[PDB]
Amino acid sequence: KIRRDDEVIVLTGKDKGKRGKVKNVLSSGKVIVEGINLVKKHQKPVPALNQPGGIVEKEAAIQVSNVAIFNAATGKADRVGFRFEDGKKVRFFKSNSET
Amino acid sequence: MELVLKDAQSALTVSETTFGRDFNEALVHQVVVAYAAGARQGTRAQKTRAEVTGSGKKPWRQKGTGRARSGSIKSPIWRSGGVTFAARPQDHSQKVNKKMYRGALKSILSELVRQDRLIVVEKFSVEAPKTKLLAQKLKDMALEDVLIITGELDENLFLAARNLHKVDVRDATGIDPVSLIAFDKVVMTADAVKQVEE
Amino acid sequence: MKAKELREKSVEELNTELLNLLREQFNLRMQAASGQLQQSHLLKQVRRDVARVKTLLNEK
RNA sequence: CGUACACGGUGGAUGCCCUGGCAGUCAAGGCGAUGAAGGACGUGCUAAUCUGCGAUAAGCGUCGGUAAGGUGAUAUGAACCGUUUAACCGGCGAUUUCCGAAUGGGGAACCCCGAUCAUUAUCCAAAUGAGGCGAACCGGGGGAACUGAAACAUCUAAGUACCCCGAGGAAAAGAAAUCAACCGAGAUUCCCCCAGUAGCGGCGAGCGAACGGGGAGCAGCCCGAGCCUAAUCAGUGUGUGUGUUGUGGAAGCGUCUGGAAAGGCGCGCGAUACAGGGUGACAGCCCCGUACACAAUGCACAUGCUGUAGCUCGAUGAGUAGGGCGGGCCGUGGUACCUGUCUGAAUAUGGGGGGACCAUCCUCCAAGGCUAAAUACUCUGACUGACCGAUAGUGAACCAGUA
C-alpha cells in the first residue's frame, strides 16, 4: 500500500522527475507529494491545479497510477524511502521481491 | 449399440456400455433452469410448524397469529406467509413433475449414447492427481471445448478436475439432471456409467 | 504534568497543586473578558490536571 | 388567426447510474433496586443539526493491537496534538449529578425521607422479598359479534377477536387401574400415514378422531420402620473443540485508437489462491483483497479431584370411586371432560379397564409426586437474490417518521 511516510517519484505529469514525501492520502485516491505545488495569485507556494476559481481544494492531486514508490521491474525509477518496529516487515523489505 | 470407452491416452477404444431410454432433446434444456430458479428461494406458505399461543402471550395485546420462534408466518397478513391468491406454489418458479424431472434424469442418461455428446473414460481417470493431466486427456480427446460444457466421474469427487472450467464435480450416486447435463451436456467415467444404471 | 509527577508528590503536595491549578483555571476565566493572552491549550489541560490529581488522590 | 416545422424556453419523461429498499438463508440472543430502558438539559476556539459524551462532557486511565499522522459527519479560519509514539480498534478497573421500580412527602424534571405490602425477627426494617421493562413464541383463566347456514333461534365464524394472571429461552406432556390386529405392543410429545375412514349432524349444510404402522428422540424414578453408607450435597481446580469478530504482506511489456486504457491485435504468466472493490474507458498477474497463517474475544458447558454416601421389611393415599339434580364445553354419540348443589363404597381371599347395562375371561391397578432429549423468530452480525429502482422499492436511497 501507499503511506504518507513513503517518498514518491512522479513519472507522467509535468512534474516528472520531482522527488518528495507524501503530505496526506485522501479516500478519493489522490496523493499530495511534498514539493509538487502551484503558484497562487499573491505568490504563495500552495499545492493545487490550474484554472480560475474561488474557495478551493488544495493539493496538486496525483494519481497512484503515475507515481513511483517501490516497483520491482525494469524501470527508470530508483531509490524510495519507507516502518521498522514491525520486524516481520523488515524481512519483506530485505527481500528484493516483497516490502 | 456399443459406447466406446477411452483410456488415459484417450485411446480410440476400450470397453462398452450404454443407456436405453428414448432420449428427448425435449428432455434436456429447462428443467435445471428450473433448478437454477427453484433452487434459489421460494416462500411456500403453510410449510412450517408455527403455532399460536392464543391470548396471554406476554403482558400486552398479542393477536393469536400463526407465530413461531418470535415472528409470525403462514398468515397472509405477515411476510413469509402464504400468498392469498391462486396458482403458484413457491416464489417466481415453474409450477409442475416428479416424473418428468426423473424422466429427464432417465432421458438424459440416454443423451450420453448420442454421437454429438460426451464419451466414457476408463476408471483410471479417478487416479489422475494433477489437473494439467486432465487438460491433456481432454485435448487428445478433442473435447477441450467441453470445458464450456462440464464434467463428471464416479467413485469420489475428482479433485484434479474440480479446478477446471465450470467444473462442478459429482458422483454417480446422487447425480441430478443438472450434473448429467450442466446444460444438456456432460461427460462421465466407466464405473460411473455402471453405477448410474440403477 | 503527567501521572508520574502526581504520584511522586506527597498528599499535601497534591492539595497545594489542586488549589493552585484551581487558581489557574479561574484566571483563565478571562475568556469571557475577551483577553488576548489566553490560550485554549492550558485552558483545556487545567480541567484534566485537576482531574488527574483528583483521581490519584482517590487511588491513594 | 388555423397547422407543421425550425431556434430558444418551460417541464420533466425517457435512457443510463444508484451510497436505498424488498426477500431468503446461516450465525448469535436478553436488559434493569452497585438505581436500567427512555427522555430533558448541557458539552467542541467559532458549531445551528446529527453523532459521541456528559460538568475528568464528541472525552480521562491501563494493557494489547496498530501506525505516522491526526484534531467525528464538514474537504472553513486560527490554532494545536503526535517519536515522553498519538489518531484509530479491542479486555479490566475508577468516576458515574437529579428524577425515574424510587420507596419520605408534594411536584408538568422542582423542594424535605428505605413509601406500601410481606417474611424472618436480636421485633431494630436489623436481615431479605415484591412493586417496572422486553419483538413476538409456551402455559393458566374470562370470552363476543359482523358472517356462513344465500332468512333464522341449535349449529357456524370462535373457542377466534378482545380482557385478566404468570414463566422461560424455550414452555406443556410423561412411565400407563394404557392399547385390545394378540401365546401381542407396551413412558410422553412431534412429523408422515392411517382418514377425510369410524363417529357427529333440521344426518341438511357441514363437522371430524383414534389404535396401529413408518420415523425423530430415548430414562427412568421418589413418601412408615430396621440397617447401613461411593446416590446426593458442599467446596476446589478448571479446559479441548467449535462458533463470532479482528489481524500480517511484492510485483506491469510491444503495435494501433484515445485526453487517459482496465480496448482491439500480438506475446507471456500465476492459480490448495475460475469472490469483490479501487485505479483518467469491459485489470485473475497495476493497488487492496482472496489461499495461507496469526491474534483477540466468547464459548467456561465438561472432565479431574476433596469431604459426603448403600441396602432391607410392610403398606400404599374417601367425601374419593360411584349415584342424582342443574349447567358449561367437546367429534363424544344413554359411550368426552370439567364446575356447582345433594348423596355416598369397598379394599388386592379387592378393584378398575377392553366405546351400551348387569353376573362369568384378558390387561392393568386410580383417588400422591418428579423427570433429560426430538422444533419454533428475527431485534442483532454476516451472506445471497431470473426481486424493485427513486410518481418503482419500506411511509422514509436526499431534514422523514422529518416538514
Curated annotation (Swiss-Prot), chain A:
Part of the 50S ribosomal subunit. Might contact the SecYEG translocation complex when it is docked with the ribosome. SMART domains: KOW. GO terms for cellular component: cytoplasm; cytosol; cytosolic large ribosomal subunit. One of two assembly initiator proteins, it binds directly to the 5'-end of the 23S rRNA, where it nucleates assembly of the 50S subunit. It is not thought to be involved in the functions of the mature 50S subunit in vitro. The gene is rplX. GO terms for molecular function: large ribosomal subunit rRNA binding; structural constituent of ribosome. Keywords: Ribonucleoprotein, Ribosomal protein, RNA-binding, rRNA-binding. PANTHER family: MITOCHONDRIAL RIBOSOMAL PROTEIN L24. The keyword RNA-binding applies. InterPro entries: KOW, Rib_uL2_dom2, Ribosomal_uL24, Ribosomal_uL24_CS, Ribosomal_uL24_KOW, Translation_prot_SH3-like_sf. Pfam families: KOW (PF00467), ribosomal_L24 (PF17136). Belongs to the universal ribosomal protein uL24 family. This is Large ribosomal subunit protein uL24. The keyword RNA-binding applies. One of its GO terms (biological process) is cytoplasmic translation.
Swiss-Prot record, chain B:
Keywords: Antibiotic resistance, Repressor, Ribonucleoprotein, Ribosomal protein, RNA-binding, rRNA-binding, Transcription, Transcription regulation, Transcription termination, Translation regulation. The keyword Lyase does not apply. Residues 44-71 are annotated as: Disordered. GO terms for molecular function: DNA binding; endoribonuclease inhibitor activity; mRNA 5'-UTR binding; RNA-binding transcription regulator activity; rRNA binding; structural constituent of ribosome; translation repressor activity. The keyword Signal does not apply. One of its GO terms (biological process) is transcriptional attenuation. Coiled coil: none annotated. One of its GO terms (cellular component) is large ribosomal subunit. One of the primary rRNA binding proteins, this protein initially binds near the 5'-end of the 23S rRNA. It is important during the early stages of 50S assembly. It makes multiple contacts with different domains of the 23S rRNA in the assembled 50S subunit and ribosome. Protein uL4 is a both a transcriptional repressor and a translational repressor protein; these two functions are independent of each other. It regulates transcription of the S10 operon (to which uL4 belongs) by causing premature termination of transcription within the S10 leader; termination absolutely requires the NusA protein. uL4 controls the translation of the S10 operon by binding to its mRNA. The regions of uL4 that control regulation (residues 131-210) are different from those required for ribosome assembly (residues 89-103). Part of the 50S ribosomal subunit. In TnaC-stalled ribosomes forms part of the binding pocket for L-Trp with the leader peptide and uL22. Belongs to the universal ribosomal protein uL4 family. The erythromycin sensitive allele is dominant over the resistant allele. HAMAP family: Ribosomal_uL4_B. This is Large ribosomal subunit protein uL4. It comes from Escherichia coli (strain K12).
UniProtKB/Swiss-Prot annotation, chain C:
One of its GO terms (biological process) is ribosomal large subunit assembly. One of its GO terms (cellular component) is cytosolic large ribosomal subunit. CDD domains: Ribosomal_L29_HIP. SUPFAM superfamilies: Ribosomal protein L29 (L29p). GO terms for molecular function: rRNA binding; structural constituent of ribosome. Disruption phenotype: Cells missing both S17 and L29 grow very slowly and have a rather unstable temperature-sensitive phenotype. InterPro entries: Ribosomal_protein_uL29, Ribosomal_uL29, Ribosomal_uL29_CS, Ribosomal_uL29_sf. Keywords: Ribonucleoprotein, Ribosomal protein, RNA-binding, rRNA-binding. The keyword Ribonucleoprotein applies. Pfam families: Ribosomal_L29 (PF00831). Binds 23S rRNA. It is not essential for growth. One of the proteins that surrounds the polypeptide exit tunnel on the outside of the subunit. Contacts trigger factor. Belongs to the universal ribosomal protein uL29 family. Part of the 50s ribosomal subunit. Contacts protein L23, trigger factor and protein nascent chains. Might also contact SecE and probably does contact SecG when the SecYEG translocation complex is docked with the ribosome. This is Large ribosomal subunit protein uL29. The lineage of its organism: Bacteria, Pseudomonadati, Pseudomonadota, Gammaproteobacteria, Enterobacterales.
